[PDB]
Amino acid sequence: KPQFPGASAEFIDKLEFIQPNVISGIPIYRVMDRQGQIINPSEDPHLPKEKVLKLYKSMTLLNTMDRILYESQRQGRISFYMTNYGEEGTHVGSAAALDNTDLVFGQYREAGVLMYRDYPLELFMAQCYGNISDLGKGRQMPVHYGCKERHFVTISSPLATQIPQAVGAAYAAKRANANRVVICYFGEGAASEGDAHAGFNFAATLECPIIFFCRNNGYAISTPTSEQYRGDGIAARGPGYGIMSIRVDGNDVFAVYNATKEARRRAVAENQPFLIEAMTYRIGHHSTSDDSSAYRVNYWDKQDHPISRLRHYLLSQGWWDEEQEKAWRKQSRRKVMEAFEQAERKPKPNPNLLFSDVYQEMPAQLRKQQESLARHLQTYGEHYPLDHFDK
Amino acid sequence: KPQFPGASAEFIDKLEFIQPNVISGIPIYRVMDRQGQIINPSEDPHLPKEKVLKLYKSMTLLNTMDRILYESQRQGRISFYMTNYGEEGTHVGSAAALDNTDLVFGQYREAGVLMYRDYPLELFMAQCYGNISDLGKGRQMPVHYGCKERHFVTISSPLATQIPQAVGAAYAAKRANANRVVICYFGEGAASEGDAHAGFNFAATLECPIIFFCRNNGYAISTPTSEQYRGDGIAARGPGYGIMSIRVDGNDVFAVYNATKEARRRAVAENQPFLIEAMTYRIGHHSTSDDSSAYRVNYWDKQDHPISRLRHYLLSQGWWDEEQEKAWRKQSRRKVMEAFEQAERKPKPNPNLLFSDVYQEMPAQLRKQQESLARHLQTYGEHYPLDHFDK
Amino acid sequence: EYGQTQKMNLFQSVTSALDNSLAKDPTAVIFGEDVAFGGVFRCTVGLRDKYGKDRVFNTPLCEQGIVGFGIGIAVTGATAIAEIQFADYIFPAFDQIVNEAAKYRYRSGDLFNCGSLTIRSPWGCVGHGALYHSQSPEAFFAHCPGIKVVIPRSPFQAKGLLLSCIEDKNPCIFFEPKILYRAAAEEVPIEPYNIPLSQAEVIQEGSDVTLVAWGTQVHVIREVASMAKEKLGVSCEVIDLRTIIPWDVDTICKSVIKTGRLLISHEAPLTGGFASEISSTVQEECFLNLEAPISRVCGYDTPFPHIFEPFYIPDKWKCYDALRKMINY
Amino acid sequence: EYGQTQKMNLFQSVTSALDNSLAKDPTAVIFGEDVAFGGVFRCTVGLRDKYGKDRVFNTPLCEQGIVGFGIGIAVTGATAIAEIQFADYIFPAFDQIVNEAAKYRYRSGDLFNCGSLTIRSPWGCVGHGALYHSQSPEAFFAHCPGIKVVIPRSPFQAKGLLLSCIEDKNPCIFFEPKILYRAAAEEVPIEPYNIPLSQAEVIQEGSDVTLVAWGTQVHVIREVASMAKEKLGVSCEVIDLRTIIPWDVDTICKSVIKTGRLLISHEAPLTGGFASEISSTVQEECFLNLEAPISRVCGYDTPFPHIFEPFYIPDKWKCYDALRKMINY
Ligand SMILES: Cc1ncc(C[n+]2csc(CCOP(=O)(O)OP(=O)(O)O)c2C)c(N)n1
Ligand SMILES: Cc1ncc(C[n+]2csc(CCOP(=O)(O)OP(=O)(O)O)c2C)c(N)n1
Ligand SMILES: [K+]
Ligand SMILES: [K+]
Ligand SMILES: [K+]
Ligand SMILES: [K+]
Ligand SMILES: [Mn+2]
Ligand SMILES: [Mn+2]
């Protein structure tokens, strides 16, 4: 028997290289088919009607808000936007499986998690407009949301940085006996970053209660996955770090839910990381700065959409109908438009706020710069958009 | 059938998390037992006597040099040293399988590769002393060797940085139709760094002819592998990136040779990366700055040593004997001592050389600083060790 | 001037520098995130079709990998033109740039080098880029011997300076002011030409005050020069620094010996910004000629804000007011 | 002064600061490469046994992970004391420090913060550390609003400043001059005490010239002060800066208003070094009092060499000669 400290293994006396199995990779777990029918009854989570209607209404309200904010950006009303089309199932199916106080770290394309947690339309709006109501004080680009009350760590643009951070939060949670999980969302592109390798490894060695949740939506901006990796997606990487791993159909809310629920239970019980790779398709452009026709959708939009698949399920069960669909479309539109109008009417925050929170206390030299802008505006204010800003 | 672009996979209708298999990991490939007997004749590489004697004499000459330089550091004659005890088999077994002009990138504990390539004792010495003969001009710490003539890229202290670099060299080699492989050595600790994840992934996606060679010697300084990772060592990570992978007994020169030879052939033919994890044990301290008794050897030194195992093989074949062992011990000692004495007698390089090669051409402001030191030494020279330095 | 020219804006002049480079240097390759289809600012459009998929290609999403990979290409002697998608995302590669690229030649005694590496990256404010699409990181690299850092002000300048970076035998970071990518076009030679590195350019002679900036901020100080002339009767000498390191100490000092006053401006934050290095050097060299303290008009010492951008940047009014105080000192 | 004291050198004062911290703050954890057995400089010896394996522990070998992980601990409100084994290896974590830690509070509008993070790292020359065991990276961090950077000169100072970093509600980098780890011991309070951040210390009053340094270099300028007095009859005011950012502008300026001359010295390379920020600020604030140009006596603009270390460093002779020229200016 080998005595080497680095591995637990038998000897082998024939030279044989381990070959990756990519052509027939980790199977994709699926609970309902594209017609919204349950494939295997023993896997049916039999969620109650009111919770399933919450999944659906959360997904559609997010879709409504996406359509309106995307168009608002094309009209020049907000500077930037990123839609969530085709991925709304990965968001609400996973959020539904969490405790309200489980801590979330994200990338930018997980707004449905905040929706599911009842984040007010007014505050999605306030962040996109950078208005006085924004708790972020208008400092970050649109869709960089954060909510301390709903345990959703403020999004930042640098990819994958949140991954080792989520692992540290999970460690602290373990020490505090919080009895809570951290979940950490990221794209398959972001999984290429060195931070992903650090997070995955630290989670397993330090034994942290964390779910790594990868949305694999086939592109990282213009880059197809054939150029992102040559292994069997992101799920196949988990076992090499000692992480329990699973691949799910991320257009199936029940498959996403079942995997997240089981991962959460085991991670919190065993203080051990889990990886979920949700297979989906990025229906929209990457962002309002991207024209995806420059490098590549309706197959996905029309055949395999999380919202269509759950609607079919709801129609099959007699839990929704055309009259309910029509009335909900109308009311959610009206609710989004009401938040929207209110958000555009608000001024931007006082310009002084560009200086606070750099440190907890403003250093004296920073206060001096703040004073210098105030004096500057007293002389040259007519050359600045002061009437757009609180005073 | 799933239609997702991110993976090639069937559906599955039962929830089942993939479990890492660590207790019974990737088996360790072995050609000869601890008595130097061939276990499976069909795996015997039947290397010719003169090449096997070169393996042996390279390993022992490196051992002789290690003993002398380690002691030279304890006497205050060189500032720093790192020995290669117990790992000399991973070095010469792999180097023996390469073409002379295959490009090597290393970490610091692969000096046997340079030995095998006939790097002069004088130049190992010159680098450790930082003397006038050092082609590195005395700029780096001891054991940071480099040789352009023998295609061995200068070692640098930051861990794993050479990994994505070796991948880029391999890409350039592919474009040039060099018909050469790059090999890139690193420790199991260094495999934790973000650079390892970048190198592995880029090698597979960009289809590069490169061998990643990991010495897994059970410790990264004080840190045992149970604290380094929780997966099945480093070999188990390769397949997840799409890299053909193998684990070998790195105290068995033939197992190391056979794996490196086959990897080289296929990598250059197919433009595809290979990963070899050589299982060994770090017999010495981490470096002359480390006292390993503070955190942890003779089992390894006496039962499973690459030099002892090949000696037994040589004795079993009638290719070496006590009289040859005795005469070789004596002559290699004398050769090392001769280089050593010559190296201590040489002055250090001219102090001006601290300024050249920062850029190819010295910028004017840097020349001004060089001129400023010259003027400084004209007034205050008696306070500097000028008599140790060329003039 | 340089054979047939044509009207190009800054993104197009970059495309032209890169096309020239891959036409004349068979070793040259271009790589990074999303470069294959033309890039998110369209700087590599057409090149993959023209030169082949092995020469213009996408990498995985990993900046430490991109720079490590490009160093490795350059170690073999092949020209490696890496792209980092925004200068704000250069930081993952900071160890490969500072500990590896910059020190490669020195630490090997010139046995090995990565001289044939250039890293190009969009840089500077863009109206609404906020904290991670607006940064100006040049001062972080200025403290690292062994690299060069170059920033152009216009399409003609960009193509000349980028070709010099590509050809220079030292690792170079070329920062492209992204707010200029589709700004006004100017005449640019179709064929290759070079503008020297470590040479500032005096773009307007003057006698009362020297103004120094780089990138977009050159255009701001040129407009401040016109305001000072009209409102104050003050003659300003306007200098584009061009190369951050190694920088053109002599040209700046000669100007300040003539004028006796220096104002330096840059979008990057004041503290540790590159203006401190220029100020402290000129002060040492020109001390006896200084009629007033050297002014620095910079970004505030904060991250770069979204909605407050108009209040953050060192605009022409901020720079004018400072200049007014300096002339009255 | 501060209750019972005992003789400690700098590594021991660090151990004592950390023991005090884990005794009084149950959330506090210490982690990094090789910290569990006591660390490669013995700064954490005994702590794992005393406080438990969940509180003092080894991470995998990945600096970007260590800093990301520590930010995450601190996001929850728990005190995270990360160790980076040598300051030369802080660069892999540069993106997590600059883009994440420094900007965490600002970018969230104070919804989230990583105030309870401290990163400690050995720093500065050590006789034969060469390029990657000798670096002084403080100027790279000085250009990053939202972090603090602190460097002590002695055991008593180190324990007071480190405890202030640990307790301060902002991410802090604490650099320990490794050449002082086993240098002379001095009396250090056994119990916790604090030395304020962003406060320089005038350690010797003088009237002709102000000398500023930090870390080991404070001891060099103190010896230069004694040489100037004996050889030149010159009275030097000696200031330990202590905090690199935010730095104590007022104390330095007040000294230079009194003396009229300033010499600043640091082992880090001249160009982009922190001396430029001090010089350019003092010049703006004290311009009318300057009797001679502000001097900077620094490391050369090269990587840090192995065999040439004695020729590289800004030693007392280099600093004395500069001071001699400045007084004769
Ligand atoms: C470190 C870093 N590099 C590059 C970017 C630019 N960038 C913003 S999103 C993106 C693609 C991310 O793709 P993926 O992770 O697959 O997420 P998706 O947008 O497809 O949901 C890139 C390259 C960035 N934000 N951070
Ligand atoms: C980026 C970086 N971090 C830390 C170090 C300090 N360090 C030098 S060697 C070493 C252990 C490396 O272990 P391993 O890779 O397992 O190689 P081995 O010494 O066991 O052959 C460490 C932590 C370094 N050189 N570079
Ligand atoms: K992020
Ligand atoms: K290295
Ligand atoms: K170059
Ligand atoms: K702190
Ligand atoms: Mn994607
Ligand atoms: Mn090891």
- Token readout for D66 is 């260590």
**B190 marked as part of a ligand binding site:** yes
Q: How far apart are CA D29 and CA D70, in angstroms?
A: 9
Alpha carbon of B220 to ligand 2 centroid (Å): 6
The class level of CATH for D201-325 reads alpha beta
> Which positions 69-88 of A are in contact with C (Cβ < 8 Å)?
79-80
Query: Experimentally, how was this structure solved?
Result: X-ray
- Of A144, A287, A305, A332, the catalytic one is A287
Report the residue from D69, D80, D109 with minimal CB separation from A136: D109
Give CA–CA dist A356/B80, Å, rounded.
49
Q: Tell me whether residue C306 is one of the annotated catalytic residues.
A: no
Which is nearest to B357 in space by CA: B145, B137, B208, B205?
B137
Give the N- to C-terminal CA distance of chain C in Å, as an integer. Answer: 43
- Positive/negative CA dihedral, B231, B233, B235, B238: positive
CA C139 vs CA B234, D143, D273: distances in Å: 39, 7, 10
CA dihedral B49, B55, B59, B65 (to 10 degrees): 90
**Nearest residue to C255 (alpha-carbon basis) of C234, C291, C282, C219:** C282
Residues in A closer than 8 angstroms to D84, CB to CB, are none
Interface C–D counts its CB contacts (< 8 A) at 131
Which fold is adopted by the domain D1-200?
Rossmann fold (3.40.50)
- The shortest CB-CB distance from D321 to any of B158, B355, B379 is to B379
* Element holding A185 (H helix, E strand): strand A182-187
To the nearest 10°, report the CA torsion of A197, A201, A206, A208: 70
Query: DSSP class of residue D97?
Result: I
Q: Which of A20, D26, C291 is nearest to B7 (CA)?
A: A20
Contact C142 D272 (CB under 8 A): yes
DSSP states of C28-50: -EEEETTTTTT-TTSTTTTHHHH
CA atoms within 13 Å, Cβ hemisphere of D24: 12
Ligand closest to CA D71: 6
Q: Is A56 exposed, middle or buried (0-12, 13-18, 19+ CB in 10 A)?
A: buried
A-to-D residue pairs, Cβ atoms closer than 8 angstroms: 147
Query: What residues line ligand 2, using a CB cutoff of 6 Å?
Result: B 109, 157-159, 187-190, 215, 217, 219-221, 282, 286; D 33, 61, 63, 85, 89, 92
Q: How far apart are CA A287 and CA A74, in angstroms?
A: 11
- Residue B76, burial from CB neighbour count under 10 angstroms (0-12, 13-18, 19+): exposed
Instruction: Residue A170: list chain D partners with CB under 8 A.
Output: 72
Helix, strand, coil: what percent of chain A each, to 5?
45, 10, 45
Distance from CA of A258 to the nearest CA of B (A): 8
The distance from CA B185 to its chain's CA centroid, rounded to whole angstroms, is 5
Task: Please answer yes or no on whether A249 and B17 come within 8 Å at the CB atom.
Answer: no
Number of domains composing chain A = 1
CA distance B293 to C291: 66
Spell B181-219 as b/e; 16+ CB within 10 A means b. Answer: bbbbbbbbbbbbbbbbbbbbbbbbbbbbbbbbbbbbbbb
Residue of C108, D132, D134 lying closest to B145 (CA atoms): C108
φ and ψ at C263, to 5 degrees? -120, 125
Longest dimension (CA), chain D: 60
Does the beta-carbon distance from D293 to C275 stay under 8 Å?
A: no
d(CA B2, CA B5): 9
User: Nearest-CA neighbor of D130 among D318, D298, D312, D323?
Assistant: D312
Cα–Cα distance between B308 and B301 in angstroms, integer? 9
CA distance D273 to D295: 13
Token couple for D138: 């403080």
Cα separation of the two ends of chain A: 77
Buried b (16+ CB within 10 A) or exposed e, C232-247: bebebbbbbbbbbbbb
Asked if A277 and A233 touch (Cβ cutoff 8 Å), the reply is yes
C65 Cβ neighbours under 8 A, 6+ residues apart: A192, A194, B164, B167, B195, B198, B199, B201, B202, C59
Q: What is the DSSP-derived secondary structure letter of residue C283?
A: H
Q: Which of B140, B158, B159 sits opposite D130 (nearest CB)?
A: B140
Joined tokens for residue C65: 């990998």
Contact B213, B276 (CB under 8 A): yes
Chain A residues with CB inside 8 Å of C36's CB? 222-223, 227
B18 contact A CB<8A: yes
Residue B134 with chain C: CB contacts under 8 Å: 109
Cβ separation B353–D65 shorter than 8 A: no
Q: Give CA–CA dist B97/B84, Å, rounded.
A: 20
Pair type for strands C56-58 and C29-32: parallel
Does an H or E element contain D66, and which? helix D63-75
Sign of torsion, CA B193 B199 B204 B206?
positive
Q: Which of C54, C62, C77 sits opposite B198 (nearest CB)?
A: C62
D98 vs C140: CB contact, 8 Å cut-off? yes
Which ranges of chain C would DSSP assign to H, the alpha helix? 10-24, 47-51, 63-75, 94-95, 104-107, 138-142, 155-167, 217-232, 249-259, 274-286, 309-312, 316-327
- Residue D99 and residue D147: Cα distance in Å, rounded? 11
List the D148-150 sheet strands across, edge first.
Answer: D56-58, D29-32, D80-83, D117-123, D172-177, D148-150, D243-245
Q: Which residue has the tokens 């040479």?
A: C199
B51-54: long-range contacts (C-beta < 8 A, 24 or more apart)?
A: B51/B96, B52/B310, B52/B313, B52/B314, B52/B319, B53/B314, B53/B319, B53/B320, B54/B92, B54/B96, B54/B116
Tokens of C3: 């054979």
Q: Which residues line ligand 1 (CB under 6 A)?
A: A 109, 157-159, 187-190, 215, 217, 219-221, 282, 286; C 33, 61, 63, 85, 89, 92
| Distance between CA atoms of residues B249 and A357, nearest Å | 56
* Best residue for ligand 2 mutational test, from D67, D85, D90, D121 (most atoms within 8 Å of Cβ): D85
With H, G, I as helix, E, B as strand and everything else as coil, classify residue A182.
strand
The reply to whether A53 touches chain D by the CB within 8 Å rule is: no
Length of chain B: 391
Active site residue C133: yes
| Cα gap A205→A186, rounded to integer Å | 21
Angle between helix axes A194-205 and A162-175 (nearest 10 degrees) is 20
Say how many CA atoms lie within 13 Å of A102 toward its Cβ. 27
- Name the residue range of residue A256's domain: 1-391
CA distances from B198 to A193, B162, C68 (A): 7, 11, 9
Q: Which residues pair with A103 in a beta bridge?
A: A182
Full DSSP string of B263-328: HHHHHHHHT--EEEEEE----S-SSTT--GGGT--HHHHHHS-HHHHHHHHHHHHTS--HHHHHHH
Q: Which residues in chain A are closer than 8 Å to C301, comparing Cβ atoms?
A: 358, 365-366, 369
Residues of D in contact with B139 (CB under 8 A): 130-131, 303, 305-308
Cα–Cα dist A314/A310, whole Å:
6
Domain with CATH 3.40.50.970 in chain C: 1-200
Phi, psi (deg, nearest 5) at residue B130: 55, 45
- Find the CATH number of the domain harbouring B81: 3.40.50.970
What is the identity of the amino acid at B341? Answer: E
Structure-token pair, residue C204 = 């307007």
Assess contact for B204 and B242: CB atoms under 8 A: yes
Distances, alpha carbon A368 to alpha carbons A362, B138, C268, C317, in Å: 10, 49, 18, 18
Q: Comparing C-alpha atoms, which of D257, D120, D138 is closest to residue D176? A: D120
Tokens representing C76? 């073999």
Closest C-alpha to A157, from A287, A62, A280 = A287
Question: Do C25 and C168 meet the contact criterion of CB atoms below 8 Å apart?
Answer: no
| Catalytic-residue membership of A71 | yes
Q: Residue C189: which H helix or E strand, with range?
A: strand C186-189
The residue with tokens 């005073």 is A391
Specify whether the CB–CB gap between D313 and D125 falls below 8 A: yes
Spatial distance between the Cα atoms of A202 and A198, rounded to a whole number of angstroms: 6
Nearest to A129 by CA among A77, A76, A63: A77
Q: Which of A4, A198, A218 sits opposite B4 (nearest CB)?
A: A218
Q: How far apart are CA D158 and CA D178, in angstroms?
A: 12
Query: Which residues are registered as beta bridge partners of D262?
Result: D210
According to DSSP H, which parts of chain B are helical? 49-74, 88-96, 111-116, 121-129, 162-175, 194-205, 253-270, 298-303, 306-317, 322-345, 364-380
Å between D278 CA and nearest CA of chain C = 8
Compute how many other C-beta atoms are within 10 angstroms of the C-beta atom of residue D327.
18
Q: Give just the sign of the alpha carbon dihedral B183, B186, B188, B191.
A: negative
List Cβ neighbours of C262 (8 Å cut-off, separation of 6 or more). Answer: C209, C210, C211, C212, C252, C255, C256, C278, C279, C282, C286, C290, C294, C295
Q: Is B102 helix (H, G, I), strand (E, B) or coil?
A: coil
CA of D135 to the centre of ligand 3 (A): 29
Q: Say how many Å lie between the CA of residue A198 and the centre of ligand 4.
A: 18
Residues of D involved in catalysis: 63, 133
Q: Are C91 and D93 in contact (CB under 8 A)?
A: no
Distance (Å, rounded) from C-alpha C243 to C-alpha C138?
Answer: 10
CB environment B366-381: b (16+ within 10 A), e (fewer): beebbeebeebbeeee
- Distance CA(A77)–CA(A387), nearest Å, equals 16
Closest of A202, A279, A281, A282 to residue A243, by C-alpha:
A202
Query: CATH 3.40.50.920 in chain D, residues?
Result: 201-325
Distance CA(C255)–CA(C286), nearest Å, equals 10
Would an 8 Å CB–CB cutoff place B41 in contact with chain A? no
The candidate with the shortest Cα–Cα distance to D267, out of D201, D315, D206, D210, is: D315
Name A391's Cβ contacts closer than 8 Å, sequence gap at least 6. A350
Q: Which of C102, D27, C55 is nearest to B175 (CA)?
A: C55
